[PDB]
Amino acid sequence: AKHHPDLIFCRKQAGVAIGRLCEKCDGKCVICDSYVRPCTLVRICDECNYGSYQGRCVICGGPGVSDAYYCKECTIQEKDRDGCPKIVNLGSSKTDLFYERKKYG
Amino acid sequence: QLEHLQSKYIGTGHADTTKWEWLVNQHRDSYCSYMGHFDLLNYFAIAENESKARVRFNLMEKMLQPCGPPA
Amino acid sequence: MFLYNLTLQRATGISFAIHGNFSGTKQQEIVVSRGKILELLRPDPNTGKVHTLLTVEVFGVIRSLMAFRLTGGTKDYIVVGSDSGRIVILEYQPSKNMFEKIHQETFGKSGCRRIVPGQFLAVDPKGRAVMISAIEKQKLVYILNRDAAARLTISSPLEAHKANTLVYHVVGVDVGFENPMFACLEMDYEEADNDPTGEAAANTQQTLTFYELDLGLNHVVRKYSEPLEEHGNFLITVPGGSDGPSGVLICSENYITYKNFGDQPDIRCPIPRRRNDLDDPERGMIFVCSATHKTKSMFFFLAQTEQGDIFKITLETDEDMVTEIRLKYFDTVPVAAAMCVLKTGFLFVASEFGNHYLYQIAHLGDDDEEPEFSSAMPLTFFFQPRPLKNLVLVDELDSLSPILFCQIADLANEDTPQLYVACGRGPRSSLRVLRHGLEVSEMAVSELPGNPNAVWTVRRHIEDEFDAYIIVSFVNATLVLSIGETVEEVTDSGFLGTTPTLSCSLLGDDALVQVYPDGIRHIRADKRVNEWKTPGKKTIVKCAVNQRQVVIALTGGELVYFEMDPSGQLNEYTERKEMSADVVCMSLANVPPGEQRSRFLAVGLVDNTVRIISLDPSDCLQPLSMQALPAQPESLCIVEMFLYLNIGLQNGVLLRTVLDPVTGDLSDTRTGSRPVKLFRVRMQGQEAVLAMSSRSWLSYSYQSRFHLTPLSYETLEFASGFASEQCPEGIVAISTNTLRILALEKLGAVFNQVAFPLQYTPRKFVIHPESNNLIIIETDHNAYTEATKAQRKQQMAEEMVEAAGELAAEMAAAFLNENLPESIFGAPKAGNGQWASVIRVMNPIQGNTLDLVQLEQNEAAFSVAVCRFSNTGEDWYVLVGVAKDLILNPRSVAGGFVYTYKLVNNGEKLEFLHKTPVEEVPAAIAPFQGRVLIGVGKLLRVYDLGKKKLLRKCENKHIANYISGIQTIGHRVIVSDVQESFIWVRYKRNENQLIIFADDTYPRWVTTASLLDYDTVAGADKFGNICVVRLPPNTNDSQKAEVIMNYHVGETVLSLQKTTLIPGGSESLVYTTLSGGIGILVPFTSHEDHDFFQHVEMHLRSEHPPLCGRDHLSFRSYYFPVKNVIDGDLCEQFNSMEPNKQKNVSEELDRTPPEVSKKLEDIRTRYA
Amino acid sequence: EYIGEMGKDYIYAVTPLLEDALMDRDLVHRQTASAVVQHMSLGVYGFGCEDSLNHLLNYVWPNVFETSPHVIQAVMGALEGLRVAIGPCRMLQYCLQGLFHPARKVRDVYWKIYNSIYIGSQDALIAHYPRIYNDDKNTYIRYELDYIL
RNA sequence: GUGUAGUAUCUGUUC
RNA sequence: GAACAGAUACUGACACAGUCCCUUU
Ligand SMILES: [Zn+2]
Ligand SMILES: [Zn+2]
Ligand SMILES: [Zn+2]
């Protein structure tokens, strides 16, 4: 998340839906990308969870197999009291990798 | 480029912020803090022989144009 | 250097009150929200004594509290909006007696923020949606739909954020089953900042817009826009649909407006005014609160004004239109911020300050003789107030919430430090005295010389509500009486009482058992004499009476077991017990409701050993277990509330033991050098115990709570109980050569109070060393002096006479004939810069005034302190600071004066001596070494007594702000700034110069301060923060100070003092707050206890979150991080936790819950 | 970061290393030192260890005048982590001096820091606000806090 | 081994 | 210290084979 300056969160009022995480994003903090002390749960806005977006990873958009939590540092800093952490940007790195794979097979 | 956090809030300053707007925002926030607290308002109620309603009314119609007229 | 936080009293200030059926039944209950404490209480129509039910701390600031019910349900759900960024919905479980969290939604950051919602809470009357709005730019709407599981659900919040807008008040509007509608006092300010010509505040009115809630499309948009011509403050809901038309009221200055959507034009009505008000005619009038008694027959709206007058608004409306609004005069009450009318005529008024009363409606006031008012009458309204006729006072609540000054000293002949608290505002101001114990009621006193030993009550029937026999026995005299409301000496008793009586019980229905040292006596209504004489000259010691079993004890331990068969004749077992000591006390278990006999038994011995014996015939009178005690036991008894046992010894100890053959816990406290004897007493229809000592101790059990509190009376030997209709609860105690009757009307658990009324609001008071008198000064804003009031009344009478009303105006004499009392009708006063000053001397023993001192209109008294001068003799001088034309909101003053008295006749007389001019009003008086320090504004002057006026010798000008307090120690002096924390000042002797050598770095709004040691200052803060600043021990005599402690209580503290509360205790830091709560700070003794408490608190912080979802660590670290302080409330919350979590935490800590409870209660017992 | 609340005892040993690191030798060392300070301050939060943390701010503060995004982000994170542990008064005092500097870039960076501290924990700021004397036209004095009982 | 951003350090010519 | 053009290093617990999350007159 922090490693990519081109990604912008939705930053909208949270609803009742629960964010989901895939296999390779199991124990990673959504905001600060940590691996220690999951404390609270992640809430996402309604429009980010509709139709094909149901049950998807918040970072990479993969299939949802694990829940999304917040670390203790984010709770202490009160950075969890914000909009939904869903990433709306498609990501330049993923598209470039896909196109390179297409060109070399 | 990552500055949207400071753009969706009320009272946030910027490069060309002068003294008047900062002071009036400070006064507004101070009045809101006075209204929110209970014992901080009880202190004012004891200090001057009025009631809670009169103090609340004075604070409500003192938030419009504090620190004098603009310039 | 680590302290512990403890609480003694609970906040009594009332801010919100909501009525409803929170238990789901048909009995109304009241929910009251304190500053940071949520309390639930209900009334009782049969008695009228209101008893608290639930009290839980929320650890946060509550800004709103509403209740609602679903469309079809019978339970009321509480919605609380606190300073946090989340909304919580609460529920009440009568069985669990605890609030249960239901739903929790977050919508922003925590704390009191301008744009964060939580201030105004809007709830639809039917209970289909809830709206929460912020001060600026933020509004939220929730839909509380219910599911098929008979529960409730919450949906996602909606968006209604208007840009750059202010909100005054939000209230729901009844629509009658269509889309809900909300109304608010919308206001715009964008053009205010766009006008540099200074024409923004003028011609800028507020509007009233309605917000729609479409359940279909699920969005909120602005619908209406109705600008007003006045400036309203708050709205009033009106029932709609079937009963009455839907609409809102517009409370304003001297006007009330009814508004509705559709074809309803605006209607105005002037506010009635009292006859010949004593206030400024140009002053406006507003409303403070209202009420809604939505009776099925008709609905009427209550109201209250600034002066405290209750009106009765009746809506005379057509089916679709409205004709006129009719007003009425109802009664007069003290100023209140929130009131609610209840069913069956009950009315609850929560006064802003002072005591809270609960009135009962006896007369409905249907078309009273006094004329009413209506909007149909063209052109002001006048009405003459009358004393309370419609309402009668039945019960009152004691609440010394507005504490302004606290002092601890011993003035009486006793050896207990009395607590003096100055509270109250205006005419209701009083000086209350707090003392540990219970209230004592005196009904009658009978003087019977002699040496009484014991007294018992025997009733002819097992469930009689009145006594039948009183065994008034002495050492060598016997007397028996009977109560018939004309108590005399009974004649047909025939008990043959010659020797002193040792036993009077009830074994059957009307069976009396008497014990004398030469045998055993049995008394029955019929001619049945089961009397057996003791063989030989041996004397029986005592017997163990009970409901169905009597066990006698003889010398040498040869106890005899007697069991009463249903036939009646006694029986003796075929076994006997023998011990090698004497028997002084016996214990018998209470009979079970179904079982005829019990099993537990206790026997006390002179050898300091107590044993448990099984009552079964298989092993009757056999040694089962062994237990040892330090001292010789005196008596033993078993009490219920599920039963607890207390062990009495020859010394002042009362061990707490659970029902168990094995030994239990050892919990004893101070209870002098007198034996403790257990005796059953009556306490609110429950089972309790009684103990005797140098001071009598009463122990009760309210919701499984134990508190060994004493009684506020002299030494007593024996006591009993008395139950009747006029006196449901009472205690009968026999004193030296006299008999006394006692009763406990109020609960009076701790800190009994006594009311001594004053004139104005007290500011400060001191205590004379030898005179032992309180010099109390008062000062009020916008007040009238008695001479000024008399002159103005004379001028008004002259004007009325000159009015020439046909010459034949008799109203001028009628008005002056009677004056309205200030304490019942309030104090009508007005002005802008009018002050007052009163100086009084009061005797602590009896609250009677000694001398009266009055000043001019523009004279204000601020500081008073008795002082002495070295150059003079033993004359005590009193100096009072006086201001001249002081106005509060703008800073502009002309000057001041300093008074000087003589204290003639050692404190019972005063006389004016002289004055002196000062540029600024003095701050405080600090006498030391025969020298008095005068603080004039930002300067610091040194003044010594002269011949005709005070003379100035030394001055210092280095304080950068206004000085609001000076504290002096035997060597140096500390000056309390208004913005800076502290400024250390050293006064040189050889050259007579004042210098500064120490100051702090963090500015603090310090109000009060105190010194704990030679280099420790316990400063305070205006907001509520408490900090201790200690100078480094390696400083010369810049040198910046350091902070060693920080804490946040959430309430403003205006008093600090480090003394000892209980005799033989330890130096504790007791403090009081303006809210009304009293707390103490206790330092730790050992590191093991410190780390155990720290671990307990750390576990409980994450295991037991607060009810309102507020971060406890962040709340305590509100302004500054907490340093070396442990919160005691979280630790004390251990008792009310669930058993499973208690077991889990006990296993985690490798301790037992009884051990944890004992460890927690050790600190409370030691330091209280 | 991993130790958490048990790192309060091991602050004395790392002070000389932090003292060496904060010197303007290379950007990587400064960034790593700022990260260390942020993590330690977040870990020791709530234990009243302000005495040791106050000294580090005097050397952390001069690391704000740089054009490298990585070091700027590290310094901002360190300041945000220290804010919850030391109190906003120190940073408010530091920012008040350079808030109205005649230059431009210093004003921008000071305003950014002030916005960062103003967004979070805004409630605990009214008490720490200073007193500014007013002119003859406008009023800049809050007389309500000068009330005396 | 490959790619995606940023930063720093040494050079051809010119102010 | 403003630039048109080259070479060498460092930082971000950064990423690396995805086959499918697909879609009308
Ligand atoms: Zn979203
Ligand atoms: Zn993923
Ligand atoms: Zn995190």
UniProtKB/Swiss-Prot annotation, chain A:
Positions of the UniProt region annotated as Interaction with SF3B1 and SF3B3: 34-50
Residues carrying the site annotation Interaction with RNA: 99
Keywords: Acetylation, Activator, DNA-binding, Metal-binding, mRNA processing, mRNA splicing, Nucleus, Phosphoprotein, RNA-binding, Spliceosome, Transcription, Transcription regulation, Zinc
Subcellular location: Nucleus; Nucleus speckle
Gene Ontology BP terms: mRNA splicing, via spliceosome; positive regulation of DNA-templated transcription; stem cell differentiation; U2-type prespliceosome assembly
Known function: Component of the 17S U2 SnRNP complex of the spliceosome, a large ribonucleoprotein complex that removes introns from transcribed pre-mRNAs. The 17S U2 SnRNP complex (1) directly participates in early spliceosome assembly and (2) mediates recognition of the intron branch site during pre-mRNA splicing by promoting the selection of the pre-mRNA branch-site adenosine, the nucleophile for the first step of splicing.
Chain sites annotated for binding Zn(2+) 2: 22, 25, 57, 60
Residues noted as binding Zn(2+) 3 in the record, renumbered to the chain: 29, 32, 71, 74
Broad class of where this protein is predominantly found: nucleus
Family matches, as Pfam families: PHF5
Modification type N-acetylalanine: residues: 1
InterPro entries given in the database record: PHF5
Phosphoserine: modified positions: 93
Gene Ontology cellular component terms for the protein in this record: nuclear matrix; nuclear speck; nucleoplasm; nucleus; precatalytic spliceosome; spliceosomal complex; U12-type spliceosomal complex; U2 snRNP
Domain of life: Eukaryota
Site (Interaction with SF3B3): 16
Species assigned in the record: Homo sapiens
Keyword RNA-binding applies: yes
UniProt-recorded name of the protein: PHD finger-like domain-containing protein 5A
Residues at which Zn(2+) 1 binds: 10, 45, 48, 84
UniProt modified residues of type N6-acetyllysine: 2
Region of interest (Interaction with SF3B3), residue spans: 78-81
Lineage of the organism: Eukaryota, Metazoa, Chordata, Craniata, Vertebrata
Swiss-Prot record, chain B:
GO molecular function list: RNA binding; splicing factor binding
The keyword Ribonucleoprotein appears for this protein: no
Record's subcellular location: Nucleus
UniProt GO cellular component terms: nucleoplasm; nucleus; precatalytic spliceosome; SAGA complex; spliceosomal complex; U12-type spliceosomal complex; U2 snRNP; U2-type precatalytic spliceosome
Superkingdom of origin organism: Eukaryota
Subunit structure: Component of the 17S U2 SnRNP complex, a ribonucleoprotein complex that contains small nuclear RNA (snRNA) U2 and a number of specific proteins. Part of the SF3B subcomplex of the 17S U2 SnRNP complex. SF3B associates with the splicing subcomplex SF3A and a 12S RNA unit to form the U2 small nuclear ribonucleoproteins complex (U2 snRNP). Within the SF3B subcomplex, interacts directly with SF3B1 (via HEAT domain) and SF3B3. Component of the minor spliceosome, which splices U12-type introns.
Family (UniProt): Belongs to the SF3B5 family.
UniProt function note: Component of the 17S U2 SnRNP complex of the spliceosome, a large ribonucleoprotein complex that removes introns from transcribed pre-mRNAs. The 17S U2 SnRNP complex (1) directly participates in early spliceosome assembly and (2) mediates recognition of the intron branch site during pre-mRNA splicing by promoting the selection of the pre-mRNA branch-site adenosine, the nucleophile for the first step of splicing.
Identification of the protein by name: Splicing factor 3B subunit 5
Organism: Homo sapiens (Human)
Shown part of the complete sequence: 10 to 80 of 86
UniProtKB/Swiss-Prot annotation, chain C:
Domain of life: Eukaryota
Residues recorded as bearing Phosphothreonine in the entry: 1152
Region Interaction with SF3B1 and SF3B5, annotated ranges: 193-231, 763-781
Chain spans, region Interaction with SF3B1: 1001-1022
Region (Interaction with PHF5A, SF3B1 and SF3B5) residue spans: 105-119, 145-168
Pfam families: Beta-prop_RSE1_1st, Beta-prop_RSE1_2nd, CPSF_A
Major location category of this protein: nucleus
Keyword Phosphoprotein: yes
UniProt site (Interaction with SF3B5): 284, 306, 352, 425, 889
Compartments in which it is found: Nucleus
Region annotated Interaction with SF3B5, chain positions: 1052-1075
Keywords: mRNA processing, mRNA splicing, Nucleus, Phosphoprotein, Spliceosome
GO biological process: mRNA splicing, via spliceosome; negative regulation of protein catabolic process; positive regulation of DNA-templated transcription; regulation of DNA repair; regulation of RNA splicing; RNA splicing; RNA splicing, via transesterification reactions; U2-type prespliceosome assembly
One GO CC term, this protein: SAGA complex
UniProt KW Nucleus keyword: yes
Assembly and interaction partners: Component of the 17S U2 SnRNP complex, a ribonucleoprotein complex that contains small nuclear RNA (snRNA) U2 and a number of specific proteins. Part of the SF3B subcomplex of the 17S U2 SnRNP complex. SF3B associates with the splicing subcomplex SF3A and a 12S RNA unit to form the U2 small nuclear ribonucleoproteins complex (U2 snRNP). Within the SF3B subcomplex, interacts directly with SF3B1 (via HEAT domain), SF3B5 and PHF5A. Identified in the spliceosome A complex; remains associated with the spliceosome throughout the splicing process. Component of the spliceosome B complex.
Free-text comment about domains: The core of the protein consists of three beta-propeller domains.
Protein name according to UniProt: Splicing factor 3B subunit 3
Natural source organism: Homo sapiens (Human)
Swiss-Prot record, chain D:
Each HEAT repeat, start to end: 8-46
Highest taxon of the lineage: Eukaryota
Start and end residues of each stretch annotated as Interaction with SF3B3 and SF3B5: 93-149
Region (Interaction with PHF5A): 1-2
Protein modification: Phosphorylated. Phosphorylation occurs concomitantly with the splicing catalytic steps. Citrullinated by PADI4.
Annotated localization: Nucleus; Nucleus speckle
Quaternary structure and interacting proteins, as annotated: Component of the 17S U2 SnRNP complex, a ribonucleoprotein complex that contains small nuclear RNA (snRNA) U2 and a number of specific proteins. Part of the SF3B subcomplex of the 17S U2 SnRNP complex. SF3B associates with the splicing subcomplex SF3A and a 12S RNA unit to form the U2 small nuclear ribonucleoproteins complex (U2 snRNP). Within the SF3B complex, interacts directly (via HEAT domain) with SF3B3, SF3B5, SF3B6 and (via HEAT domain) with PHF5A. The SF3B subcomplex interacts with U2AF2. Identified in the spliceosome C complex.
Family: Belongs to the SF3B1 family.
Name of this chain's protein: Splicing factor 3B subunit 1
Gene: SF3B1
Included stretch of the parent chain: 1156 to 1304 of 1304
